[PDB]
Design an enzyme around this catalytic site. Structure first.
Site, PDB file in Angstrom:
ATOM      1  N   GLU A   1     -45.534 -34.939 -76.466  1.00 59.28           N
ATOM      2  CA  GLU A   1     -45.223 -34.116 -77.625  1.00 59.28           C
ATOM      3  C   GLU A   1     -45.322 -32.604 -77.432  1.00 59.28           C
ATOM      4  O   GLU A   1     -46.114 -31.930 -78.090  1.00 59.28           O
ATOM      5  CB  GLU A   1     -46.103 -34.570 -78.798  1.00 59.28           C
ATOM      6  CG  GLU A   1     -45.663 -35.924 -79.345  1.00 59.28           C
ATOM      7  CD  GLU A   1     -46.717 -36.634 -80.177  1.00 59.28           C
ATOM      8  OE1 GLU A   1     -46.321 -37.399 -81.083  1.00 59.28           O
ATOM      9  OE2 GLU A   1     -47.926 -36.450 -79.929  1.00 59.28           O
TER      10      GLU A   1
ATOM     11  N   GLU B   1     -44.678 -45.497 -76.345  1.00 63.98           N
ATOM     12  CA  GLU B   1     -45.459 -45.787 -77.548  1.00 63.98           C
ATOM     13  C   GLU B   1     -44.635 -46.614 -78.525  1.00 63.98           C
ATOM     14  O   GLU B   1     -43.494 -46.260 -78.843  1.00 63.98           O
ATOM     15  CB  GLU B   1     -45.913 -44.495 -78.241  1.00 63.98           C
ATOM     16  CG  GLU B   1     -46.947 -43.713 -77.456  1.00 63.98           C
ATOM     17  CD  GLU B   1     -47.352 -42.438 -78.141  1.00 63.98           C
ATOM     18  OE1 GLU B   1     -47.562 -42.467 -79.372  1.00 63.98           O
ATOM     19  OE2 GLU B   1     -47.477 -41.408 -77.447  1.00 63.98           O
TER      20      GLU B   1
END
Ligand code: NA
Ligand code: NA
Ligand code: NA
Ligand code: NA
Lengths: 409, 204
Positions: free
Chosen positions: B51, B127
């Site tokens: 991220e 994820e």
């Protein structure tokens, strides 16, 4: 059997136009095009001979080119003295598509240096580019979504004789029901068919008259070099006949004939002779080296059918198999036999969600039923075996979306 | 093995990672990790972090690893999960059949992602199946797909253990605490508990 298509007499001059090919190439945004026309002649070669190719948009001549015979040097022995290639520049060409079938008229004049006409040939010209790039079939630079259907040449009373009224009726019904493409299952059609598709606007898969389904294995003949000559003529003579029709966007090597060396040879022949159109063929697994498009028959949306040697993978799975990058268009799907088409919506949801799933051709357009009359003279629809024919496959000849008389199912 | 780099709170997410002024700081977090763990056989893939959007610094460091250690693929999800800085399509929470067409960084159905025009890389979710509280509904849908599609090679569930902390009442009895229970604010309360097992490793 029989003489089921037109018969005629054609008068040509001694010195004549023996062949001509029309091509249209474009720049990046299609704002400019070049119409290339190769013309061949037969007869005595003379310096006074000329060929003029003029392009018309209605009664307006948009472009024109004139030149004497004698092509560019090709090899150590020179070039074709009996050929000439004309090239015409066309700014902002009106593009052809099934949405807007824009057409121009090309007139090929064989004449003397000072204007005396010997003869003239012509064809309708549709400016459009068909190409596969990055896994997508593109028409004028846009990814197509084929709303197609397979259409046999069938008439309940006349059998396999085709007439203009019937052809027009089919095209209108097809377009009225949101179809934009048709597959000539499984052979070159009556010549008028292509002219109608050019003008009304339908994408056409032109297919060679080659099917050896009944052989065991299916490629026993197509992999036999002894049958290469017969096969080559069905492919080459088809291309030589329909290569100038804008509606034809894809060539097919036939159907259900397995995958043999003959298919590979002919696939390359077409690719060499006409680079303007992709070549497809479903035999041998739908994704062989003889097809530019993954074109399975009845492969399901989410369910795999892992048959040995020729599995029919779920179409969504087929696209991403390791190493695969080609577009997928079913040459046959949603078998509309009787009360059918259940699950049709599943196919279209997938077509719309996946870029590389670009549609398919429903099987098929019209029931192949024939009219017979009872003792009272009243007509009824007949199928396999109703004529004493045996062995026969009964109602399996009726898989259409419309009845033989064109009444919708 | 993942580099200690995450700039999730930046606006846009790649504000620092696209800034050459931060290339040195980022490079050390990547290069020193490799120099330390490159001999461990268990490590089969290098990750540039998480991220932090997709910045030019990522491209530079992606290449540095490819050059220094060719024996291991390099992945990174930032900027769309399929940028030029990753050898593997590694989306976070992309669904099986449903698309989530967010602008710039859409999360395509994983089955659809594999065959986007020109795409050929394997897809392994870095994820997926967020196990927060009573969850993991639809987990079976991911595995049916993983097994049917060769290039869908799995993923990493998020995540292993609840990040809850222990506090005690007036009688000395311990209880599980989450965001905000320590007077910490602003805080994101229970969002720190997304595991398959409780903090004490008791299974959910
Ligand atoms: Na599509
Ligand atoms: Na049939
Ligand atoms: Na898999
Ligand atoms: Na969390």
């Amino acid at each position: 059997s029989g003489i089921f298509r037109d018969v005629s007499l054609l008068h040509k001059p001694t010195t004549q136009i023996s062949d001509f090919h029309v091509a249209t190439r474009f720049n990046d945004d299609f704002s400019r095009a070049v119409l290339e026309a190769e013309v061949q002649m037969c007869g005595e070669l003379r310096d006074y001979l000329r060929v003029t190719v003029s392009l018309w948009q209605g009664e307006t001549q948009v472009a024109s080119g004139t030149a004497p015979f004698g092509g560019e040097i090709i090899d150590e022995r020179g070039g074709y003295a009996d050929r000439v290639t004309l090239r015409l520049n066309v700014e902002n060409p009106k593009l052809w598509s099934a949405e807007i079938p824009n057409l121009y008229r090309a007139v090929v004049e064989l004449h003397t240096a000072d204007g005396t006409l010997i003869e003239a040939e012509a064809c309708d010209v549709g400016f459009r580019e068909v190409r596969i790039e990055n896994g997508l079939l593109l028409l004028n630079g846009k990814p197509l979504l084929i709303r197609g259907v397979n259409r046999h040449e069938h008439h309940p009373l006349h059998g396999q004789v085709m007439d203009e009224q019937t052809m027009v009726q089919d095209i209108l019904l097809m377009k009225q029901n949101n179809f934009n493409a048709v597959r000539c299952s499984h052979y070159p059609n009556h010549p008028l068919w292509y002219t109608l598709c050019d003008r009304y606007g339908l994408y056409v898969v032109d297919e060679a008259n080659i099917e050896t389904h009944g052989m065991v294995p299916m490629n026993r003949l197509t992999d036999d070099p002894r049958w290469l000559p017969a096969m080559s003529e069905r492919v080459t003579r088809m291309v030589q006949r329909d290569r100038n029709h804008p509606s034809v966007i894809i060539w097919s090597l036939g159907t259900e004939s397995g995958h043999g060396a003959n298919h590979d040879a002919l696939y390359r022949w077409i690719k060499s002779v006409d680079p303007s159109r992709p070549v497809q063929y479903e035999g041998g697994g739908a994704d062989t080296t003889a097809t530019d498009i993954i074109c399975p028959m009845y492969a399901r949306v989410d369910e795999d059918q892992p048959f040995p040697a020729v599995p029919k993978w779920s179409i969504k799975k087929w696209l991403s198999l390791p190493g695969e990058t080609r577009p997928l268009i079913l040459c046959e799907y949603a078998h509309a036999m009787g009360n059918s088409l259940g699950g049709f919506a599943k196919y279209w949801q997938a077509f719309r969600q996946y870029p590389r799933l670009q549609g398919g051709f429903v099987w098929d357009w019209v029931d192949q039923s024939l009219i017979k009359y009872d003792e009272n003279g009243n007509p009824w629809s007949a199928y396999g075996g109703d004529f004493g024919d045996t062995p026969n496959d009964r109602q399996f000849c009726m898989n259409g979306l419309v009845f033989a008389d064109r009444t919708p199912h």
